């Protein structure tokens, strides 16, 4: 009912959601009563085999992930899909005995929706875990910006810069590809804008830090001024990174 | 789960195609 929130999810489930709607258009909403559905044992046994596989691949993920939220949230989706499968199977049987069975049609619709819905939940949960990984990179840059305060040597500054360079570059790549995958254009705009702002402030931060280190070890002058520009750049960067974290979590 | 989910989608769409054949 909502737009699938990534392009991958949309290309997987969008075909299925449409087919389900076409099935409903007939049969249910009071319309094509008394039609006659053929034997569905074949196509249901194939869904059943795909359900098995999905649950296989999923239970390997669960016992293998570090993500504790993932570990908890996947199992319910497995239940929803197996339970929806169980109706599809009862529908195959019911239609074998009566091609005109109306409970068989209701089960078939409910079942199909349950497969869609449970597979949607399984993919969302998985996606959420991928997003938390990007948020891990973001919070580590945030933590590290907190430590710009304690840099006072040129040697400190160059270590700070060596360790910050990879973090920023990994983040930039992650947000770039994430943004591409999104299906809400306004969410891409925010991530690109916030990111572009962080990127452009990075060299300003380093220049601000050079300035503060240099004014400090020339042993006096406008140190209070150099201090509040470095601080502003860190508050402004941390603000954007936080905005990035918030917007990544939208769906 | 991407290949697992593609396969369940392909299987379900095909089921749902055979229920209007």
Swiss-Prot record, chain A:
General function of this protein: Actin filament (F-actin)-binding protein involved in cell-matrix adhesion and cell-cell adhesion. Regulates cell-surface E-cadherin expression and potentiates mechanosensing by the E-cadherin complex. May also play important roles in cell morphology and locomotion.
Subcellular localization(s) per the UniProt record: Cell membrane; Cell junction, Adherens junction; Cell junction, Focal adhesion; Cytoplasm, Cytoskeleton
Protein name, as recorded: Vinculin
Region named Talin-interaction: 168-208
Tissue expression remark: Isoform Metavinculin is muscle-specific.
Impact upon substituting residue 160 to F: No change of phosphorylation levels in platelets
Coverage span on the entire protein: 2 to 251 of 1135
Gene name of the record: VCL
PTM summary: Phosphorylated; on serines, threonines and tyrosines.
Assembly and oligomerization: Exhibits self-association properties. Interacts with APBB1IP, NRAP and TLN1. Interacts with CTNNB1 and this interaction is necessary for its localization to the cell-cell junctions and for its function in regulating cell surface expression of E-cadherin.
Phosphotyrosine modified-residue sites: 100
Comment field on protein domains: Exists in at least two conformations. When in the closed, 'inactive' conformation, extensive interactions between the head and tail domains prevent detectable binding to most of its ligands. It takes on an 'active' conformation after cooperative and simultaneous binding of two different ligands. This activation involves displacement of the head-tail interactions and leads to a significant accumulation of ternary complexes. The active form then binds a number of proteins that have both signaling and structural roles that are essential for cell adhesion. The N-terminal globular head (Vh) comprises of subdomains D1-D4. The C-terminal tail (Vt) binds F-actin and cross-links actin filaments into bundles. An intramolecular interaction between Vh and Vt masks the F-actin-binding domain located in Vt. The binding of talin and alpha-actinin to the D1 subdomain of vinculin induces a helical bundle conversion of this subdomain, leading to the disruption of the intramolecular interaction and the exposure of the cryptic F-actin-binding domain of Vt.
Result for mutant: residue 100 to F: Some reduction of phosphorylation levels in platelets. Little change in cell spreading. Complete loss of phosphorylation. No change in subcellular location nor on in vitro actin binding. 40% decrease in cell spreading
Assigned protein family: Belongs to the vinculin/alpha-catenin family.
């Amino acid at each position: 009912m909502p737009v699938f929130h990534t392009r991958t999810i949309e290309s997987i489930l969008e075909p299925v959601a449409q087919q389900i709607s076409h099935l409903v258009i007939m049969h249910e909403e009071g319309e094509v009563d008394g039609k006659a559905i053929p034997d569905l044992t074949a196509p249901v046994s194939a869904v059943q085999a795909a359900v098995s596989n999905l649950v296989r691949v999923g239970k390997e993920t669960v016992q293998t992930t570090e993500d504790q939220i993932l570990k908890r949230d996947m199992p319910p989706a497995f239940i929803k899909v197996e339970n929806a499968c169980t109706k599809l199977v009862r529908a195959a049987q019911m239609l074998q005995a009566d091609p005109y069975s109306v409970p068989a049609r209701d089960y078939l619709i409910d079942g199909s929706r349950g497969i869609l819905s449970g597979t949607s939940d399984l993919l969302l949960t998985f996606d959420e875990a991928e997003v938390r990984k990007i948020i891990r990179v973001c919070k580590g840059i945030l933590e590290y910006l907190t430590v710009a305060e304690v840099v006072e040597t040129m040697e400190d500054l160059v270590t700070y810069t060596k360790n910050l360079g990879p973090g920023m570059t990994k983040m930039a790549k992650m947000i770039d590809e994430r943004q591409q995958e999104l299906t809400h254009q306004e969410h891409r705009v925010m991530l690109v804008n916030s990111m572009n702002t962080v990127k452009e402030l990075l060299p300003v931060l380093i220049s601000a830090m050079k300035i503060f280190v240099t004014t400090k070890n020339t042993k006096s002058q406008g140190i209070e001024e150099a201090l509040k520009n470095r601080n502003f750049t860190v508050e402004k960067m941390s603000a954007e990174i936080n905005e990035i974290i918030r917007v990544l979590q939208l769906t | 789960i991407l290949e697992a989910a593609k396969s369940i989608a392909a299987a379900t769409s095909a089921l749902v195609k055979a229920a209007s054949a």
